[PDB]
Design a protein around this ligand. Structure first.
Ligand SMILES: Nc1ncnc2c1ncn2[C@@H]1O[C@H](COP(=O)(O)OP(=O)(O)OP(=O)(O)O)[C@@H](O)[C@H]1O
Length: 382
């Protein structure tokens, strides 16, 4: 046989986990990262996927694809698609109602369906697993947001099929997280769980009611255009202003300088979740000018204060829809890389009047973790 894996196919980052000997292994990639960007890039000589693709976006903007999760299973005439595409640096065409990403690979013009792009990311996760396990991976459980309709779930299933993966089941991300913490164990009564998911580009809030192991999504709220990337932006715009003030040079026009600065910001942001300040060191940011400076956790929180605070509005709504009070929810689990931000943790905890948050499992790995367990039971290994 071969172990069934659990795969989190996120908008910005993906993750693969496997259940073995009662424990879940979150598999690190070639670069030793526990999560890998959902990026694909096409050049004159090759197809790059994951870290290698993200690590060269500043050079190949028009041929570096991302955000395929926003297209998958949708129609070209979709209002969502129409709005979104006005921001992607890559081409999106209409092939008989179905949207397609168009890129140049080896001088030749090629187009791909969103599911084909996602299959590429899925193939990378699969080989990462296989490289770790030292055996071929066939069966898998792939996750999807609770709000995905049948077409989107269909497309996600298909993306898996072309990747050579036998998708055992498509389960919701909120359910995957709950299972990771064992909140699916049959107790004697009804359990209301609140899943607070803030990733790279999306924000979801789901309230689940678990009784006899059976889940029931009572409500969902959030924002599909609020994520860790928005926090990076605030830093970027802040440093562009600082560069301009200190050097009288506006670097906004130079798409490369900006993208390089953003990469520095996103990294400094992570450090800020553990330290109180981080330094930005960028050689030749603009012209021959090096950009050496730093931010504090204090300044960082200030730059995103409105964004952090507004995160509570969707929480209030989810509650009222589900017709529950703060006191009625028994468990709160954090999901998504962005929830590692201290201020966000304080803000949510304060809202739930001190209630302890579930966050012992890396928030950005929780979904894969749960999927891996679910895969195990479905396979017959648990
Ligand atoms: N220590 C940290 N502090 C803050 N943000 C972090 C930290 N570690 C990772 N991140 C951020 O988390 C985000 C990635 O989150 P995650 O890996 O959960 O995304 P995902 O599921 O692909 O995203 P999405 O919710 O957009 O589909 C990025 O914005 C990254 O900068």
């Amino acid at each position: 046989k071969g172990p069934a894996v659990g795969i989190d196919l996120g908008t910005t980052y993906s993750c693969v986990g496997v259940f073995q000997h009662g424990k879940v292994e979150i598999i690190a990639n070639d670069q030793g990262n526990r999560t890998t960007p959902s990026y694909v890039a096409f050049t004159d000589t090759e197809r790059l996927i994951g870290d290698a693709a993200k690590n060269q976006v500043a050079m190949n903007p028009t041929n570096t694809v991302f955000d395929a999760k926003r297209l998958i299973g949708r129609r070209f005439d979709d209002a969502v698609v129409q709005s979104d595409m006005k921001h992607w640096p890559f081409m999106v065409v209409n092939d008989a109602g179905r949207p397609k990403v168009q890129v140049e690979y080896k001088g030749e013009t090629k187009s791909f369906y969103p599911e084909e792009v996602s299959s590429m990311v899925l193939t990378k996760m699969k080989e990462i697993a296989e490289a770790y396990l030292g055996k071929t991976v066939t069966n898998a459980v792939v996750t999807v947001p609770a709000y995905f309709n049948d077409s989107q779930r269909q497309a996600t299933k298909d993306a898996g099929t072309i990747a050579g993966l036998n998708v055992l089941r498509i389960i919701n991300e909120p359910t995957a997280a709950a299972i990771a913490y064992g909140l699916d164990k049959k107790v004697g009564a009804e359990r209301n769980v609140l899943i607070f998911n803030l990733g790279g580009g999306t924000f979801d809030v789901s309230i689940l009611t678990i009784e006899d192991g059976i889940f029931e999504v009572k409500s969902t709220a959030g924002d599909t255009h609020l994520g860790g990337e928005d926090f990076d932006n605030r830093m970027v715009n802040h440093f562009i202003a600082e560069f301009k003030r200190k050097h009288k040079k506006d670097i906004s026009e130079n798409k490369r300088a900006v993208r390089r600065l953003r990469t520095a910001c996103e990294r400094a942001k992570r450090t800020l979740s553990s330290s109180t300040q981080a330094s930005i060191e960028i050689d030749s940011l603009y012209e021959g000018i090096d950009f050496y400076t730093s931010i504090t956790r204090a300044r960082f929180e200030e730059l995103n204060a409105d964004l952090f605070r507004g995160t509570l509005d969707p929480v209030e709504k989810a509650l009222r829809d589900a017709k529950l009070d703060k006191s009625q929810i028994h468990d709160i689990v954090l999901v998504g890389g962005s929830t590692r931000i201290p201020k966000i943790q304080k803000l949510l905890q304060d809202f739930f009047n001190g209630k302890e948050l579930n966050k012992s499992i890396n928030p950005d790995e929780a979904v894969a973790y749960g999927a891996a367990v679910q895969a195990a039971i479905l396979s017959g290994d648990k």
